[PDB]
Short mmCIF file of C-alpha atoms and ligand atoms in Angstrom, two decimals:
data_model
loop_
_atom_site.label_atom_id
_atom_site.label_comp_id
_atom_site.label_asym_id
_atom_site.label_seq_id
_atom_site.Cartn_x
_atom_site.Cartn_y
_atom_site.Cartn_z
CA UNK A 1165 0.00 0.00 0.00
CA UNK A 1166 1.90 3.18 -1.24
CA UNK A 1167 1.38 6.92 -1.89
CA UNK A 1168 2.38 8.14 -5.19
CA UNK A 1169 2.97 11.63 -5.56
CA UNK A 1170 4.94 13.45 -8.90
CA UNK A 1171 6.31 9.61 -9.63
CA UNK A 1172 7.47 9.30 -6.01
CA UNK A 1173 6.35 6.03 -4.69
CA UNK A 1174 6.24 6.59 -1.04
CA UNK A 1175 6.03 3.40 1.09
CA UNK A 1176 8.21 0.84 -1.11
CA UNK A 1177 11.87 0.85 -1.21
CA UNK A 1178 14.48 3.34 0.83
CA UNK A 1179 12.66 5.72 2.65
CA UNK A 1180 11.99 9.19 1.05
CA UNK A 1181 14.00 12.22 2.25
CA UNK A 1182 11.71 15.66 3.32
CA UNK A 1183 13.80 19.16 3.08
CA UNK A 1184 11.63 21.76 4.81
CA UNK A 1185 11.05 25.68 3.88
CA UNK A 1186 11.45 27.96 6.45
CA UNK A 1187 11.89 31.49 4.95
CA UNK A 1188 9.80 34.51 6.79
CA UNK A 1189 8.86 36.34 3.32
CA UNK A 1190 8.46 35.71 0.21
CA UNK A 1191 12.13 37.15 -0.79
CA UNK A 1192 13.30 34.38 2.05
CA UNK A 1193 11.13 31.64 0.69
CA UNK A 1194 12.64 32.34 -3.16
CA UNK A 1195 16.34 32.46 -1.79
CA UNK A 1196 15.72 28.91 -0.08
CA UNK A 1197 14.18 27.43 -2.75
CA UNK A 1198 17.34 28.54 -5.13
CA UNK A 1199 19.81 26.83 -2.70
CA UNK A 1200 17.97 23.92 -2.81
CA UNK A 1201 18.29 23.71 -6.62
CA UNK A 1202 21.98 22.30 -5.50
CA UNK A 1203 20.20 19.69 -2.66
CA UNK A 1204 19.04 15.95 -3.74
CA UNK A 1205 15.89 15.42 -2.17
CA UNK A 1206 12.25 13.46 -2.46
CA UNK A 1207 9.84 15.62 -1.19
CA UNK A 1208 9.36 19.81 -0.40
CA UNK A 1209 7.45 20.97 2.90
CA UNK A 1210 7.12 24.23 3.50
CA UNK A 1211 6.48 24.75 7.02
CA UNK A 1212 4.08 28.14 6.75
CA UNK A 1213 4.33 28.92 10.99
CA UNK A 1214 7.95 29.77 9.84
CA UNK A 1215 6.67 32.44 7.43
CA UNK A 1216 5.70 36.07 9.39
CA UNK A 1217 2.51 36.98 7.63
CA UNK A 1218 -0.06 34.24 8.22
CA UNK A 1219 -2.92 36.39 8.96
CA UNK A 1220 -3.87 36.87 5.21
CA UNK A 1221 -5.10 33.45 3.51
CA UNK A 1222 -3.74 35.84 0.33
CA UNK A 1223 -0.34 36.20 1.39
CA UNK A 1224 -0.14 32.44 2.41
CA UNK A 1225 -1.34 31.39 -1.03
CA UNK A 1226 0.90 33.51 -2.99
CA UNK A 1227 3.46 32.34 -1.22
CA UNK A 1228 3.02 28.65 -2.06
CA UNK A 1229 2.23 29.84 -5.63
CA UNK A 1230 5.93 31.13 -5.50
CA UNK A 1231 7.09 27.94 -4.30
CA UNK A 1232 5.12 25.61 -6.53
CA UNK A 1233 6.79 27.39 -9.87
CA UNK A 1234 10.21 27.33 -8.79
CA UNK A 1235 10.02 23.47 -7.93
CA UNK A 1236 6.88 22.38 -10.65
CA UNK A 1237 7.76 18.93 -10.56
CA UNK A 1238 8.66 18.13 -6.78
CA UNK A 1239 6.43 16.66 -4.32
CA UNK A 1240 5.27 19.63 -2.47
CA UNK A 1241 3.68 19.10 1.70
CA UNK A 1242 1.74 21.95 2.93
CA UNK A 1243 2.65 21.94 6.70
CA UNK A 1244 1.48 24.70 9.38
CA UNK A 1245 2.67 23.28 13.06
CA UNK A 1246 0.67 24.83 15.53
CA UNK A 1247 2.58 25.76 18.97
CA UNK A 1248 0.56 23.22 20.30
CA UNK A 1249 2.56 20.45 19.09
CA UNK A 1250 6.28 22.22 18.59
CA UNK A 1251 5.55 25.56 16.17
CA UNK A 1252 6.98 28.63 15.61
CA UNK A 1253 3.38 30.51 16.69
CA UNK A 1254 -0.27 30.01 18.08
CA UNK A 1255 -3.07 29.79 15.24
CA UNK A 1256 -6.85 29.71 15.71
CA UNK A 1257 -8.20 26.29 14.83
CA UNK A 1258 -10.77 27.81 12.52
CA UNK A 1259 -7.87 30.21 10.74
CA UNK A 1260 -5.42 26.90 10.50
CA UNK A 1261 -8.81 25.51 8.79
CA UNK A 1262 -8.78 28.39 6.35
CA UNK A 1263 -5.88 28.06 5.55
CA UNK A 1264 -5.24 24.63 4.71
CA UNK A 1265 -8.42 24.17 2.84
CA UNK A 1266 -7.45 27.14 0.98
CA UNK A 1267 -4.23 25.52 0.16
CA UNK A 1268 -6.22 22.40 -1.28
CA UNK A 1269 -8.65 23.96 -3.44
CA UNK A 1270 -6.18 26.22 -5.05
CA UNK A 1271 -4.30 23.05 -6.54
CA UNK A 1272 -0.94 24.48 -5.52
CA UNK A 1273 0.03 21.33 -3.45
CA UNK A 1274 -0.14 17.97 -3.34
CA UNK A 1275 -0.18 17.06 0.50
CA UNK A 1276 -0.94 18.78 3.33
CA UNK A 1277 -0.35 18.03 7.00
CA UNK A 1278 -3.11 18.00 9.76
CA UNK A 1279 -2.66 17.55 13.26
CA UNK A 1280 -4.11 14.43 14.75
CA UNK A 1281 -5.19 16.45 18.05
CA UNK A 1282 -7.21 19.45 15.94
CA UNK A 1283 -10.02 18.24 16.87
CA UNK A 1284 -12.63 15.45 15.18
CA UNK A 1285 -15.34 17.52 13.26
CA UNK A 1286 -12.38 19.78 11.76
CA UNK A 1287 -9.98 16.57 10.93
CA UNK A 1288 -12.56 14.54 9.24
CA UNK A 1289 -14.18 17.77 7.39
CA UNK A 1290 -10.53 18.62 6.42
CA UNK A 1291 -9.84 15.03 4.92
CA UNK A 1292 -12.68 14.71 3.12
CA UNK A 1293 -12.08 18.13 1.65
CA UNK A 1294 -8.22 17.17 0.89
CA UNK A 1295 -9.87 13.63 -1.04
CA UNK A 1296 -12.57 15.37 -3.07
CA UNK A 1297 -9.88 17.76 -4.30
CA UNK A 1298 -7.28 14.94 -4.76
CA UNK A 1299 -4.79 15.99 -2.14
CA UNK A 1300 -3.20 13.34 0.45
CA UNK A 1301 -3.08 14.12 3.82
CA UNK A 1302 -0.23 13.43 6.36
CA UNK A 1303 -2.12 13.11 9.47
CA UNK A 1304 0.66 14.12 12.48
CA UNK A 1305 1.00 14.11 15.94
CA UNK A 1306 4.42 15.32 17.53
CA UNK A 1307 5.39 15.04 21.71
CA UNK A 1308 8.51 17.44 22.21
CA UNK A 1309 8.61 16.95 25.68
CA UNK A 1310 8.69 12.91 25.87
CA UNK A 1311 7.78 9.58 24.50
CA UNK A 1312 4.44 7.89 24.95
CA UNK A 1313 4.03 4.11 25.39
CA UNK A 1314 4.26 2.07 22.92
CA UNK A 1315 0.45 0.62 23.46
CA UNK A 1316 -0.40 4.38 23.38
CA UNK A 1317 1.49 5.20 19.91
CA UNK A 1318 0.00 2.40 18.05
CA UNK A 1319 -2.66 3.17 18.93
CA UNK A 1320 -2.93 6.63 17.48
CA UNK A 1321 -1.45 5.56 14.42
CA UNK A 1322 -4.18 3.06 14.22
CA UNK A 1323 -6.79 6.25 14.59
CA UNK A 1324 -4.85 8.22 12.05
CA UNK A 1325 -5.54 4.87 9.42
CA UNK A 1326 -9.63 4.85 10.74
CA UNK A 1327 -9.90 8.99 10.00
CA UNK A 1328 -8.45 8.35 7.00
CA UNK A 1329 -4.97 9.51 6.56
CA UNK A 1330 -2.64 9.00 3.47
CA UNK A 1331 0.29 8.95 5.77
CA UNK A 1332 -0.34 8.37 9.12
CA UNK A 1333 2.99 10.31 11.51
CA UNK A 1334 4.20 10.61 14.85
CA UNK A 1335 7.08 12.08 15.92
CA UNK A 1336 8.19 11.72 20.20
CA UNK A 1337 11.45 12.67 21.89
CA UNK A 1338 13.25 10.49 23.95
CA UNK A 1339 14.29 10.99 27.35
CA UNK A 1340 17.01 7.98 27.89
CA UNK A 1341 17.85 5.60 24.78
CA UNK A 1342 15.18 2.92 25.89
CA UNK A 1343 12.46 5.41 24.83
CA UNK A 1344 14.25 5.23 21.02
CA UNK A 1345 13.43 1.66 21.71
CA UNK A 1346 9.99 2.32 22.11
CA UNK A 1347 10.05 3.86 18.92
CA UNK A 1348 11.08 1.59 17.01
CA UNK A 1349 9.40 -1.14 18.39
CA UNK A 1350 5.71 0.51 18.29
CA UNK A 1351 6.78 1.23 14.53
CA UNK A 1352 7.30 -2.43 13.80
CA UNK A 1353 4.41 -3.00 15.61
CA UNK A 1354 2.72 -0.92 12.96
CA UNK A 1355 4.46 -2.58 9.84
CA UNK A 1356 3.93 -5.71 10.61
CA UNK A 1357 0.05 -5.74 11.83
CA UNK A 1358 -1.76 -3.25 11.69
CA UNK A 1359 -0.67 -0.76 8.61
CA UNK A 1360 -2.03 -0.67 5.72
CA UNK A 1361 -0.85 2.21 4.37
CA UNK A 1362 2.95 4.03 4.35
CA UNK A 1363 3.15 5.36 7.99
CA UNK A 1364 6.41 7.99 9.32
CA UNK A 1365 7.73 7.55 12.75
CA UNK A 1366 10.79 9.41 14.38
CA UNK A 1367 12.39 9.66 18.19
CA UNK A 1368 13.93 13.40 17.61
CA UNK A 1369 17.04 14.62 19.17
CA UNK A 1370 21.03 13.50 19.08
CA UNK A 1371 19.74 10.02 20.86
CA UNK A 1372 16.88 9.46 18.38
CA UNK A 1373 19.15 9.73 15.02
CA UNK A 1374 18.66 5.88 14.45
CA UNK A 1375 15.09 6.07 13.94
CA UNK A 1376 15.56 8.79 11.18
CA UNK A 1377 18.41 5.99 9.20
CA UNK A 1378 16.37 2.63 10.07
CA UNK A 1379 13.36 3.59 7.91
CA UNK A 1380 13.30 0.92 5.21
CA UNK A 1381 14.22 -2.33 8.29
CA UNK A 1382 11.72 -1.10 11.12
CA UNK A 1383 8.95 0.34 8.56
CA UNK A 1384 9.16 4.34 8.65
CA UNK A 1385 8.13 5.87 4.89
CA UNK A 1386 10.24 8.74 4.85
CA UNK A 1387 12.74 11.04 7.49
CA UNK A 1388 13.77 14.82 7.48
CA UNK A 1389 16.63 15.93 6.42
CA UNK A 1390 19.09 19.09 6.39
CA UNK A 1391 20.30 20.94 3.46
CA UNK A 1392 21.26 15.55 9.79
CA UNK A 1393 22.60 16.78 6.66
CA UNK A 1394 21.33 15.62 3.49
CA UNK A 1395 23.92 13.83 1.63
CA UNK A 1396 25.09 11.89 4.37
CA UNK A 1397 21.03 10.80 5.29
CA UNK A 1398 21.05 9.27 1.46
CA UNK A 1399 24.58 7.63 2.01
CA UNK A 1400 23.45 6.00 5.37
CA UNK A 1401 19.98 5.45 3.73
CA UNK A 1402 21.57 3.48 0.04
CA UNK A 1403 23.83 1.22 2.34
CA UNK A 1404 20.95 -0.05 4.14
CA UNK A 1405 18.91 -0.15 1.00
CA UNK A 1406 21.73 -2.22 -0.33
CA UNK A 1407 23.41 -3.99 2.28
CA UNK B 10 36.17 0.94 31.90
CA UNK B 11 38.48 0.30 28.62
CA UNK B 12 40.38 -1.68 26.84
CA UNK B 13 43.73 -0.53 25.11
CA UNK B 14 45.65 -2.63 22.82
CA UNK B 15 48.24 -0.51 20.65
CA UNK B 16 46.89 2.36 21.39
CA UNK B 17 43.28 1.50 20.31
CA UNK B 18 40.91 2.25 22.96
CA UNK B 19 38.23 0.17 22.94
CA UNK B 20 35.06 0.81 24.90
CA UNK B 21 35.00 4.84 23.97
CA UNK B 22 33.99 6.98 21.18
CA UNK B 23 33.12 5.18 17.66
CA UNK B 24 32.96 1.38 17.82
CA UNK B 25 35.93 -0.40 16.31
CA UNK B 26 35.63 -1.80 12.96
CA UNK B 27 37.34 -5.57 12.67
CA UNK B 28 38.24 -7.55 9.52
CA UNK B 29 38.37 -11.38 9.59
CA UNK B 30 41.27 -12.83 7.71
CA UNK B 31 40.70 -16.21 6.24
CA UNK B 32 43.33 -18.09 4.06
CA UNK B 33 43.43 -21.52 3.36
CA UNK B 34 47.28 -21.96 3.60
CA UNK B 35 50.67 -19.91 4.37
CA UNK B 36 50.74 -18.38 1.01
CA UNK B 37 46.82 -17.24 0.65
CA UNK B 38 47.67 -15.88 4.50
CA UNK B 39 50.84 -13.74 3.15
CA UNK B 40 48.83 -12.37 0.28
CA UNK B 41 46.05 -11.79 1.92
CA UNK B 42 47.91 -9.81 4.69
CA UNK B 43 49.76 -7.61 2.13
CA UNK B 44 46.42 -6.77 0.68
CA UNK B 45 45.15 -5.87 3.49
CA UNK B 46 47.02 -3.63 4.81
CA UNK B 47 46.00 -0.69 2.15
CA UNK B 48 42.19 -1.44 3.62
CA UNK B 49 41.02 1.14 6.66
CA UNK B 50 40.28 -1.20 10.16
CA UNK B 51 40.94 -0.87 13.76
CA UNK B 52 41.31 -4.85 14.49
CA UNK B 53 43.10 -7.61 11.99
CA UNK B 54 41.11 -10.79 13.50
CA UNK B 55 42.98 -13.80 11.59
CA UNK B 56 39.94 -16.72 11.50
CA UNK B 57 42.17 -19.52 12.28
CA UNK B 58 39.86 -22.26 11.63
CA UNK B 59 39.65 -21.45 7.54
CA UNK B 60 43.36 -22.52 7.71
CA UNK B 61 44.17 -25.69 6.57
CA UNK B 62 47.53 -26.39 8.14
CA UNK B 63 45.48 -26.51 11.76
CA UNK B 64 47.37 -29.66 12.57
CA UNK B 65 50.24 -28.31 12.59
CA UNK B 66 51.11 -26.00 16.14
CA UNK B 67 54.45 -24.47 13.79
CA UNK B 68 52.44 -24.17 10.66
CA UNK B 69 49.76 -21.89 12.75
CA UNK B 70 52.24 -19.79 14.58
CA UNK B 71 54.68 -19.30 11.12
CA UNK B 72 51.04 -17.68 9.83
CA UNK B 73 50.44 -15.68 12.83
CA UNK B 74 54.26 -14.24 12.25
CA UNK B 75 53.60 -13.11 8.51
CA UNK B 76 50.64 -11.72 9.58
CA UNK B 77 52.20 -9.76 12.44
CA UNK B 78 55.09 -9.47 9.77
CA UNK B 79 52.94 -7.27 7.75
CA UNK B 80 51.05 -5.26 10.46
CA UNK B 81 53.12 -4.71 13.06
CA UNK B 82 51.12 -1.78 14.41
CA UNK B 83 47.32 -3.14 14.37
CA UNK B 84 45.69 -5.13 17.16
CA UNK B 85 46.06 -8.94 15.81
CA UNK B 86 43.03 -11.11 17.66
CA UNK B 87 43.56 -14.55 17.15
CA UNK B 88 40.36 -16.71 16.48
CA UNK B 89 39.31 -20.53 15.98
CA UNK B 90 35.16 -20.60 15.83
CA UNK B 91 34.57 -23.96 16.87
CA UNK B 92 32.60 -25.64 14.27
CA UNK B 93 29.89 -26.45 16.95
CA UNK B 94 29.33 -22.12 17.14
CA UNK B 95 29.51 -21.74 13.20
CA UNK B 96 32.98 -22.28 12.37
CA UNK B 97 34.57 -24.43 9.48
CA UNK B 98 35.95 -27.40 11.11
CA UNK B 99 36.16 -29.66 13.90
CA UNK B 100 38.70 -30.24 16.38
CA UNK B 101 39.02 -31.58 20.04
CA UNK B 102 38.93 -29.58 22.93
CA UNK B 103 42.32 -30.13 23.43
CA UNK B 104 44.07 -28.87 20.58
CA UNK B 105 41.52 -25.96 20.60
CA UNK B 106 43.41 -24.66 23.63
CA UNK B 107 46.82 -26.27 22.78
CA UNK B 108 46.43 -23.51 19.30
CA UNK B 109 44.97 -20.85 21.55
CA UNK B 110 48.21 -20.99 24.38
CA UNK B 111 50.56 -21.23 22.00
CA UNK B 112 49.34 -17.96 20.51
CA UNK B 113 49.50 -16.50 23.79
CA UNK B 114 52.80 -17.34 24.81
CA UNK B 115 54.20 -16.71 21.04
CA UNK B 116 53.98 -12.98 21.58
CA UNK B 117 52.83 -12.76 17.74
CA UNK B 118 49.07 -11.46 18.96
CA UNK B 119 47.13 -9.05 20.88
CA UNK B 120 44.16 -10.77 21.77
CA UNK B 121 42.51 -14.25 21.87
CA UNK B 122 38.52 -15.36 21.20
CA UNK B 123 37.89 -17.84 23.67
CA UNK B 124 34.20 -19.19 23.29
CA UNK B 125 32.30 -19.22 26.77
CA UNK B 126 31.09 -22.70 26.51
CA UNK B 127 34.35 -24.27 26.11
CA UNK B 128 33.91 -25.49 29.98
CA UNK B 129 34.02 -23.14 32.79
CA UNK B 130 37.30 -24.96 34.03
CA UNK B 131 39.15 -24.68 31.00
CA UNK B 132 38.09 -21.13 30.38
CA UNK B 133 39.09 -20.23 33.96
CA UNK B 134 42.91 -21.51 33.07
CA UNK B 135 42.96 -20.31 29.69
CA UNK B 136 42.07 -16.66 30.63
CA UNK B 137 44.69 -16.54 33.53
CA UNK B 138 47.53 -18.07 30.65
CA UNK B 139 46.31 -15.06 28.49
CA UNK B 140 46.60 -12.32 31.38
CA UNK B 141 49.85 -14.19 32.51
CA UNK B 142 51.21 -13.24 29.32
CA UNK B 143 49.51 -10.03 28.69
CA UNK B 144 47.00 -11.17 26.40
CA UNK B 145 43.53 -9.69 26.37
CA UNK B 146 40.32 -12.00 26.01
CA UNK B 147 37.70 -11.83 23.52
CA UNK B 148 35.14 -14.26 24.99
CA UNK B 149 32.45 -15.16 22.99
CA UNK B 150 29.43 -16.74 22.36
CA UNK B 151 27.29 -17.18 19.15
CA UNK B 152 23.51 -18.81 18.25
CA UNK B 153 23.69 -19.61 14.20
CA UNK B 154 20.10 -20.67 14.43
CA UNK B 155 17.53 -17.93 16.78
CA UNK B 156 17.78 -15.34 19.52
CA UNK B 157 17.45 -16.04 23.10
CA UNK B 158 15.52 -14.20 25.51
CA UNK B 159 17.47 -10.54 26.45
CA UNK B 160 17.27 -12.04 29.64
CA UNK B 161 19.25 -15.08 28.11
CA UNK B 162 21.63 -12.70 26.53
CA UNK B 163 22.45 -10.79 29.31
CA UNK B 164 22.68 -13.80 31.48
CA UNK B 165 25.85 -14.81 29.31
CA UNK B 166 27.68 -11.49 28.97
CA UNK B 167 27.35 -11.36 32.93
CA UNK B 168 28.90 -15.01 32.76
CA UNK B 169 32.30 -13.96 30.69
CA UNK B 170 32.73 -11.22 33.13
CA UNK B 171 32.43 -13.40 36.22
CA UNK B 172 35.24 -15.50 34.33
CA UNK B 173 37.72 -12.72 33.74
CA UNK B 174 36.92 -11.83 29.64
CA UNK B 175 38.17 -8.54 28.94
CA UNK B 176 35.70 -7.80 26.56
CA UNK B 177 31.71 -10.00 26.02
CA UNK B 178 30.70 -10.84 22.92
CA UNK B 179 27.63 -12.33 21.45
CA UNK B 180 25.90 -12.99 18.30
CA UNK B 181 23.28 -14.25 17.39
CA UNK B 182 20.67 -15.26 14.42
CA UNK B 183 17.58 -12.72 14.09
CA UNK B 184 14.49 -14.43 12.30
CA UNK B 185 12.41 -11.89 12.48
CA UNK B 186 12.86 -7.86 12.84
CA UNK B 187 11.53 -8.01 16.05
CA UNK B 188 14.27 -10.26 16.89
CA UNK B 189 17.01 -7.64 15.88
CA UNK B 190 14.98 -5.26 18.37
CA UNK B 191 15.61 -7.73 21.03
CA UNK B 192 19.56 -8.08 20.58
CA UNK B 193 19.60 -4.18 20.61
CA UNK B 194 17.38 -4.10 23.86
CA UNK B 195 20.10 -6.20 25.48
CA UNK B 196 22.92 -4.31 24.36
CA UNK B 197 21.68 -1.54 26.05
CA UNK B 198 20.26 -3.71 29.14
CA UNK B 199 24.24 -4.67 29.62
CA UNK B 200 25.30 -0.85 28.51
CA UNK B 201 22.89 0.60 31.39
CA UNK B 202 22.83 -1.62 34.62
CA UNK B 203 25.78 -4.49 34.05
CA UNK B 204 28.46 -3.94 32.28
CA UNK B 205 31.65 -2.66 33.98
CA UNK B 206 33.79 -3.55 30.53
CA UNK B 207 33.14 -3.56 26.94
CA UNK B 208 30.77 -5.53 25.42
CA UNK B 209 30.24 -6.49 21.56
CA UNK B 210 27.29 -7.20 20.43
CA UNK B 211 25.61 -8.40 16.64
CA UNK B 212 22.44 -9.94 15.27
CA UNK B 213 23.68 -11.26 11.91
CA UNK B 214 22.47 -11.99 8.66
CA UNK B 215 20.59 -9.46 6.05
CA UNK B 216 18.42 -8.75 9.11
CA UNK B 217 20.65 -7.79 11.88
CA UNK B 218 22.72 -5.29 9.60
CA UNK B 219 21.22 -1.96 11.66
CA UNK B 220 22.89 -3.80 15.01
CA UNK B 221 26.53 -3.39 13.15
CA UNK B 222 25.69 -0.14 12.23
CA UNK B 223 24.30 1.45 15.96
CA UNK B 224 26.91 0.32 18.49
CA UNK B 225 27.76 3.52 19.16
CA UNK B 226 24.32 3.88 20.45
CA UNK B 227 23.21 1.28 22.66
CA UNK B 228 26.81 0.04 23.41
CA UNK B 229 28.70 -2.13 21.11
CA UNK B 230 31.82 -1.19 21.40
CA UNK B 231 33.07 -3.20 18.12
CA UNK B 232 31.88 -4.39 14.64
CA UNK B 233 32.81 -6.76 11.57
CA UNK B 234 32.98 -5.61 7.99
CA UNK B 235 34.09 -6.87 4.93
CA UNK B 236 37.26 -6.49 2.93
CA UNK B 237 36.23 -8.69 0.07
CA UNK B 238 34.51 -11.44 1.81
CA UNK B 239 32.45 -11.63 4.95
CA UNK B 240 33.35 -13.81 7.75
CA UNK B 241 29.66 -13.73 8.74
CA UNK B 242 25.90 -12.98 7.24
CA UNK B 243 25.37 -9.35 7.36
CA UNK B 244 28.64 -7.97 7.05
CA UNK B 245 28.96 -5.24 4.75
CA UNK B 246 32.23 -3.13 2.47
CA UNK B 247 34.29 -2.15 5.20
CA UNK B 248 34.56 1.63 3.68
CA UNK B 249 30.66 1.91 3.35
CA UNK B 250 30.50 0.30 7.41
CA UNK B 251 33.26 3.05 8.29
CA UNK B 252 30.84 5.98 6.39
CA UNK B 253 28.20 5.10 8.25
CA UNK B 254 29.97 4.90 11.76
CA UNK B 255 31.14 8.10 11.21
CA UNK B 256 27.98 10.25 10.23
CA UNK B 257 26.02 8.73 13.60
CA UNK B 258 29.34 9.30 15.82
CA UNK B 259 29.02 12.95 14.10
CA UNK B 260 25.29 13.66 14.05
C1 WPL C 1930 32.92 -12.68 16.73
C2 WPL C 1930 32.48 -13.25 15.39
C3 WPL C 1930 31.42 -12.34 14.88
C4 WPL C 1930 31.00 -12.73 13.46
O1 WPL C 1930 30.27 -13.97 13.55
C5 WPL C 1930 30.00 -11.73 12.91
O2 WPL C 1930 30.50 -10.71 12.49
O3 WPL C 1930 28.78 -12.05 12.81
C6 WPL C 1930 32.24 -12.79 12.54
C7 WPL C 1930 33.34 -13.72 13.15
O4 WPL C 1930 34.55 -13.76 12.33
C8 WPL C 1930 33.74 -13.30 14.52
O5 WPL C 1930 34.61 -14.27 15.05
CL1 CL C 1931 -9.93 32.31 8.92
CL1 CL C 1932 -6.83 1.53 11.87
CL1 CL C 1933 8.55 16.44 12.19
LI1 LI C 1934 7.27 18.92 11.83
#
């Protein structure tokens, strides 16, 4: 069960690489997507609580407009991370709304992510409004503080899958290097029984940097990279394809 | 705590890559160790039971010396795997240990594998020849078929330290990935709570490869790769294993 986005087949083979945006304007956003011209990647998110002017749905959307024509033919993820769950700033649920079903209807990108914890009317409304308009949605939950059980991560993955998510994700961070453990062992979990669909799964931090390389054995779809650096995520991640 | 041979130090900062080196006779042994020496490792471990010339106690030691010959700097661990823990051929207990003391008392090597379930006796007597003659010991223990318990696992490492090892090592056969999780859990089991030494750790085959590639980790303190041909399933180029060591250590 894959994803296939712009020819990417997300879900088979070595896990697919994510570079994020991060620019405050649009000047900022077209200088970043230059450098990356000279960057090997799978897949474009441009994380929008980066960028300084989110208040107009106008500016937001000309700014992914920008972005779409310098990279036409990349994969491109639509991501605003709320403060709730590791952001840059606070957002209204019903402006995050606006925005991201703006974003879909305008055709300007091909995935989108939506926070898990939003809330249930507003997630399902969302994916079915992503679907109809023939956008995927990464459905994400992040704990920067520490790392849930593994009973309790499968099991939200699991609800991801039942509201319908393209790509079910969780991110955690670990507080000792058992809870990387925990990890990885709620993301075989995953793989092996109850996925049916390409899921992402990372322990962040220095003592997590094994879950973002062990994609393709444990079952993780795809990691975030750097323009850890870029070049040496695809070295580490073609060894293991390999090996 | 540490182990230094040569100025190696073993038990701190990137795990230690070793190459097995496995020649049938004293001239595949001399080529073999000129070719390697162009090749980027911490530890030369010379497989002793792919040599043909076992029954001979001058034959082994003259291919020790051309080794040592051609490497005089690198830790040299000397290494029969008994064919009952995966290795090539049979012999009795006796001139298992008759081989490993005269490598010990030669002066040609470092270090010596000596495999835990050898006989508690005879392990006890080897390990004091080894220290008598500054030697350290690699003791070992390998399942070519499944993974035991962590609880298993750790039960053994705990064992070779009781008996004097200078450094634990296990490996064992994943046959599932949830098997591989388990070898790493008791890595870090030993790494957290038991281990006053270090430890080396592996679940082989296709597998296991992510356990040869994390020791830094969960606390492996050494792993095998390949020059041109493994000495185990699993092992990998030993250039692409060194890559890989060195953007976690960095990260
Ligand atoms: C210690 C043992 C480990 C291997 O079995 C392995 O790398 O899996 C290779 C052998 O040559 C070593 O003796
Ligand atoms: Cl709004
Ligand atoms: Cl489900
Ligand atoms: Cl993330
Ligand atoms: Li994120």
């Amino acid at each position: 069960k894959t994803v296939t986005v712009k020819n990417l087949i997300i879900g088979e083979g070595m896990p697919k690489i994510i570079v994020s945006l991060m620019g405050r304007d649009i000047n900022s956003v077209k200088a970043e997507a230059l450098a990356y011209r000279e960057a090997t990647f799978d897949i474009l998110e441009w994380r929008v609580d980066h960028f300084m002017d989110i208040a107009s749905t106008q500016s937001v959307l000309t700014a992914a407009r920008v972005i779409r024509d310098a990279m036409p033919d990349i994969p491109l993820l639509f991501t605003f991370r709320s403060a709730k769950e590791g952001g840059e700033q606070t957002i209204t649920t019903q402006h995050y709304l606006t925005l991201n079903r703006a974003a879909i209807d305008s055709g300007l990108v091909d995935m989108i992510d939506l926070e898990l914890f939003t809330g249930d009317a507003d997630v399902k409304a969302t994916v079915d409004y992503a679907h109809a308009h023939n956008v995927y949605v990464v459905m994400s939950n992040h704990d920067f503080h520490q790392t849930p059980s593994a009973e309790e991560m499968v099991l939200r993955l699991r609800k991801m899958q039942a509201l319908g998510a393209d790509i079910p994700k969780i991110a955690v961070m670990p507080q000792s290097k058992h809870d990387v453990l925990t990890l990885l062992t709620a993301t075989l979990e995953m793989q092996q029984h109850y996925a049916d669909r390409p899921v992402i799964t990372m322990s962040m931090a220095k003592e997590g940097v094994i879950s973002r390389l062990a994609g393709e054995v444990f079952g993780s779809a795809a990691t975030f990279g750097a323009v850890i650096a870029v070049n040496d995520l695809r070295s580490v991640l073609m060894i293991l394809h390999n090996a």
